[PDB]
């Protein structure tokens, strides 16, 4: 080991003739046992390589080949050194890269090569990405940006900008942020963009500018505003005089949208509302409006005729900022009128849709009637065309804005009603078109929401027979129709509606079970169908209460003081009850008879059980039935039998763990049952349904899932580094494991409220043994994710947890904090996770030794974090996390 | 070898796509239109049953006008027969009532306007299904435009 290294070092210091074989001898001297016994050091061989390289280069075109093979061999040495683990320290390697790239004596190919090693090794390892200091970060950024500014241009320039985005990503992710004195540097780069035409690496530069402005938007707001005011005209000139590269266009539009957010947070218009106004900025806005108007009328701006969402948002924001040369809705109406083809009509409709959806008040009350008339004229074209769904969804937010206004005069409201009735009768036909099924039901629910057009008896005929299958648009239209209208008795119409909702073929599953619906939506409609007063039940149901760069907009609003976040039992139709019960039992027999172990899936049974428990909870919340007799109903028996028949899937899975085809169905039903449960303690039908679902669950499946937790716990592009918290390290089995932990945590935290067959004490014991100190390994991503999820879910303020359990949970925090102190993202994540155990740590009625030990450990770790923050070792996000936990 | 409508019904049943189903429907329609007597009275009920099953496919497809014309020709052939038994005539009346209540939807589609109007006219002229008050509502307002298909059945 040491003797071999000494011999290799001595051989490398000999003459060139001897070195010709000494290089190969040193390359072949490495071996697996040698590196196994060498684990510690690597700094010795690193500096040996350093001195060998410097002595080789110390002593034209001939030397280029020698440089090539020495670069190849040092690259091989770096790759093999970090093949297993990154033992080599990144500091000296980065200094070597810096001192070899700073000088112009080394060739550009060597610079590109060392950049490749920098990205593949330094920029691909989290430890290397995190151990770089702020001063080293900023000096490396400065030297690389100065190299990018060199007049020499080669193929590597687009490569160099790739570093620029990465390093800028590093300083804003691991450090608090470098000073603003470097901003002018980028300005000069922008000036360079005004001269060069290739723009090979300009996309990366623009992306780096966008991310840097997003990071630094917290401070230097005036500096950012003036920098934008002086830089955006250059970007406008480039856009005018460029080949319109898609990446360049999208990054430029992203920068423009960021600047609009900076200048006009949350659509602010006047100076007193928080927005910043200037003549140059207004001229820039007008020029950008003209450019967007020119560009939207292009083939490549969209076979597809739909414009991308970013363009629509940018155009709508510009229109809102400029609407009061004179601009207004008149030019929009003229463009709509003169659009003789769908190609030039769809973009304007999209712009109007987005503008009304985001800014309902941007449309004056005088122009709503002309807009409605032009939309009505453009709606029919003798058949279902491309623009038909666009117009259908454009009318939706127009109707919504009409709902959200009350200053309209009597004449105007009468005129809009006499136009909306014709709109209703026109849109009544064409519902059978399935390709616009989602769009049609958007209007029908919306208008009924505002009571603009009185519902007719013929509308109730639509939800009958096999005219349309029960889908989410259909049910969300039906519920809104039911809230503000009374179903006619033509005792039979309600029966037809119930039949259509529960249409069963006498061998395909009903569409309600096949597809997914929002939780507790069909059940409310079903229980109100039998209600004496459906409208009253509707008004009663929703009367119950409930428990990125966007946040920078609210931050600016708080800073400017524009938005103050602070200082702010019915009887039921008896006759329909037995009919509903008969339908339920019939579908129960149909589902049970055709059920099979393999061919029949399980999530359909889960959805049917959700429907049954929703109906039961709705009945319990009313005075229809009592809870005790609800427990004894045959609906409970069928719901239990559903999971009894579905448990054989888990029984087969626990024996055949290697199976990879059932994982999708199991994860589907597992996500469904997680969405079924509700952890809120308020008196709501959701709580009753969750309790029923928990009490349905048997102990055998609980034990099986707890055992397979331990069974599976033993299993063994991006510009910069990979976040350890990212999902790319998580496979399908990992996703199943995490949502399985979610389900089990919800079950253990919500079962104690009611009476269940299974005992939660042993379940919690297994959960804690899953994260046992001997078993848990902080170095593993899966184990760390499981620990964070368990810490997030186990604590609960409703009922105090045992102090032994919470101290056992808190014990493995110290080592994972120590091993991941250099990574800011994991620190902020764990700080966000640890704040939910305080609600149970605060309750200390039984002041024992364990309580004092747990609170002392928490106090010590919080104090250590506070001291670390006082040492300027944590980024701003860590500071917000610490403030939140305090 | 034995040949008959049984193989035609089998081909209709096994046709999983409109490519292999439209030609057989066209052949049946032509045979019924030209030679009504070629279809024995025993197989008309299974033929109508398979046609009713093949009529809906969750949207307006290419085979829909062909199925509509086939049903029209079947109704026309049923018009020119009087030897049917009481049980068979009652069963076909019930099946035609089901077809009547099914065919109301999709009337707004102008592409299959002519076929829908022809089928409705065939059923009404044959007196297979008693007309309802909802039928008169169809020719009201601006839901459909007056045309030759809209008046040939109306008269």
Swiss-Prot record, chain B:
Induction: By ionizing radiation. The chain holds residues 389 to 543 of 3056 of the full protein. The gene is ATM. Belongs to the PI3/PI4-kinase family. ATM subfamily. This is Serine-protein kinase ATM. It is linked to Ataxia telangiectasia: A rare recessive disorder characterized by progressive cerebellar ataxia, dilation of the blood vessels in the conjunctiva and eyeballs, immunodeficiency, growth retardation and sexual immaturity. Patients have a strong predisposition to cancer; about 30% of patients develop tumors, particularly lymphomas and leukemias. Cells from affected individuals are highly sensitive to damage by ionizing radiation and resistant to inhibition of DNA synthesis following irradiation. Found in pancreas, kidney, skeletal muscle, liver, lung, placenta, brain, heart, spleen, thymus, testis, ovary, small intestine, colon and leukocytes. Serine/threonine protein kinase which activates checkpoint signaling upon double strand breaks (DSBs), apoptosis and genotoxic stresses such as ionizing ultraviolet A light (UVA), thereby acting as a DNA damage sensor. Recognizes the substrate consensus sequence [ST]-Q. Phosphorylates 'Ser-139' of histone variant H2AX at double strand breaks (DSBs), thereby regulating DNA damage response mechanism. It is found in: Nucleus; Cytoplasmic vesicle; Cytoplasm, Cytoskeleton, Microtubule organizing center, Centrosome; Peroxisome matrix. The FATC domain is required for interaction with KAT5. Homodimer. Dimers or tetramers in inactive state. On DNA damage, autophosphorylation dissociates ATM into monomers rendering them catalytically active. Binds p53/TP53, ABL1, BRCA1 and TERF1. Interacts with NBN (via FxF/Y motif). Part of the BRCA1-associated genome surveillance complex (BASC), which contains BRCA1, MSH2, MSH6, MLH1, ATM, BLM, PMS2 and the RAD50-MRE11-NBN protein complex. This association could be a dynamic process changing throughout the cell cycle and within subnuclear domains. Interacts with RAD17; DNA damage promotes the association. Phosphorylated by NUAK1/ARK5. During the late stages of DNA damage response, dephosphorylated following deacetylation by SIRT7, leading to ATM deactivation.
């Amino acid at each position: 080991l040491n003797d071999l290294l000494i011999c290799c070092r001595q051989l490398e210091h000999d003459r060139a003739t001897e070195r010709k074989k000494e290089v190969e001898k040193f390359k072949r001297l490495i071996r697996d046992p040698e590196t196994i016994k060498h684990l510690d050091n690597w700094d010795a061989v690193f500096r040996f390589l350093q001195k060998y390289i410097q002595k080789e280069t110390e002593c034209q075109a001939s030397r280029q080949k020698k440089m090539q093979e020495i670069s190849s061999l040092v690259k091989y040495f770096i790759k093999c050194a970090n093949r297993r683990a990154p033992r080599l320290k990144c500091q000296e390697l980065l200094n070597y890269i810096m001192d070899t790239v700073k000088d112009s004596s080394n060739g550009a190919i060597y610079g590109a090569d060392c950049s490749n090693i920098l990205l593949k090794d330094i920029l691909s390892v989290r430890k290397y990405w995190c151990e770089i200091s702020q001063q080293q970060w900023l000096e490396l950024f400065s030297v690389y940006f100065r190299l990018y500014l060199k007049p020499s241009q080669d193929v590597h320039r687009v490569l160099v900008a790739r570093i620029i985005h990465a390093v800028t990503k590093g300083c804003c992710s691991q450090t608090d942020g470098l000073n603003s004195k470097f901003l002018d540097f980028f300005s000069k780069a922008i000036q360079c963009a005004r001269q060069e035409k290739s723009s090979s690496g300009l996309n990366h530069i623009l992306a780096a500018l966008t991310i840097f402005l997003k990071t630094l938007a917290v401070n230097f707001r005036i500096r950012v505003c003036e920098l934008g005011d002086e830089i955006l005209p250059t970007l406008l000139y480039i856009w005018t005089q460029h080949r319109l590269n898609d990446s360049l266009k999208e990054v430029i539009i992203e920068l423009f949208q960021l600047q609009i957010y900076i200048h006009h947070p949350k659509g602010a218009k006047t100076q007193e509302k928080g927005a910043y106004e200037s003549t140059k900025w207004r001229s820039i806005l007008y020029n950008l409006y003209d450019l967007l108007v020119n560009e939207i009328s292009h083939i490549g701006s969209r076979r597809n005729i739909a414009v991308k969402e970013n363009l629509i948002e940018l155009m709508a924001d510009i229109c809102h900022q400029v609407f009061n040369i004179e601009l207004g809705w008149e030019v929009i109406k003229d463009h709509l009128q003169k659009s003789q083809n769908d190609f030039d009509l769809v973009p304007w409709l999209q712009i109007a849709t987005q503008l009304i959806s985001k800014y309902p008040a941007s449309l004056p009350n005088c122009e709503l009637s002309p807009l409605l008339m032009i939309l009505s004229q453009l709606l029919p074209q003798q058949r279902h065309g491309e623009r038909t769904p666009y117009v259908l969804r454009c009318l939706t937010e127009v109707a919504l804005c009409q709902d959200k206004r009350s200053n309209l005069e009597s004449s105007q409201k009468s005129d809009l009603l006499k136009l909306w009735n014709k709109i209703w009768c026109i849109t009544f036909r064409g519902i059978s078109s399935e390709q616009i099924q989602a769009e049609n039901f958007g209007l029908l629910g919306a208008i009924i929401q505002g009571s603009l057009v009185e519902v007719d008896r013929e509308f109730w005929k639509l939800f009958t027979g096999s005219a349309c299958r029960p889908s989410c648009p259909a049910v969300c239209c039906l519920t809104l129709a039911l809230t503000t209208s009374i179903v006619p008795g033509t005792f039979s119409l309600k029966e037809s509606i119930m039949k259509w909702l529960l249409f069963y073929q006498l061998t395909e599953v009903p569409p309600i079970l096949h597809s997914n619906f929002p939780h507790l939506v069909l059940e409310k409609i079903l229980v109100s169908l039998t209600m004496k007063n459906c409208k009253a039940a509707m008004n009663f149901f929703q009367s119950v209460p409930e428990c990125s760069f966007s946040e920078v907009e609210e931050l600016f609003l708080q800073t400017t003081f524009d938005k103050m976040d602070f200082l702010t039992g019915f009887s039921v139709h008896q006759n329909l009850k037995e009919s509903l019960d008969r339908c339920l039992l019939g579908l129960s027999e149909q589902l049970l008879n055709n059920y099979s172990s393999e061919i029949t899936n399980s999530e359909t049974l889960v959805r049917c059980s959700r429907l049954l428990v929703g109906v039961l909870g709705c009945y319990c919340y009313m005075g229809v039935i009592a809870e005790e007799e609800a427990y004894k109903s045959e609906l409970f028996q069928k719901a239990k039998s559903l999971m009894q028949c579905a448990g054989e899937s888990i029984t087969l899975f626990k024996n055949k763990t290697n199976e990879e085809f059932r994982i999708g169905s199991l994860r589907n039903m597992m996500q469904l049952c997680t969405r079924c449960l509700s952890n809120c303690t308020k008196k709501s039908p959701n709580k009753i349904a969750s309790g029923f679902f928990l009490r349905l669950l048997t102990s055998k499946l609980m034990n099986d899932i707890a055992d397979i937790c331990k069974s599976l716990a033993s299993f063994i592009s991006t510009i910069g580094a990979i976040n350890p918290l990212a999902e790319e390290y998580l496979s399908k089995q990992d996703l199943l494991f995490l949502d399985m932990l979610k389900f089990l945590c919800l079950c253990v935290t919500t079962a104690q409220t009611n009476t269940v067959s299974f005992r939660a004490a042993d379940i919690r014991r297994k959960l804690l043994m899953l994260i046992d100190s001997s078993t848990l390994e902080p170095t593993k991503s899966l184990h760390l994710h499981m620990y964070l999820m368990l810490l997030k879910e186990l604590p609960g303020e409703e009922y105090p947890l045992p102090m032994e359990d919470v101290l056992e949970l808190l014990k493995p925090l110290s080592n994972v904090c120590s091993l991941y102190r250099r990574d800011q993202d994991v620190c902020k994540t764990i700080l966000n996770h640890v704040l939910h155990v305080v609600k149970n740590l605060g309750q200390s009625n039984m002041d024992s030794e364990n309580t004092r030990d747990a609170q002392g450990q928490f106090l010590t770790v919080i104090g250590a974090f506070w001291h670390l923050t006082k040492e300027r070792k944590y980024i701003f996000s860590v500071r917000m996390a610490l403030v939140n936990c305090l």
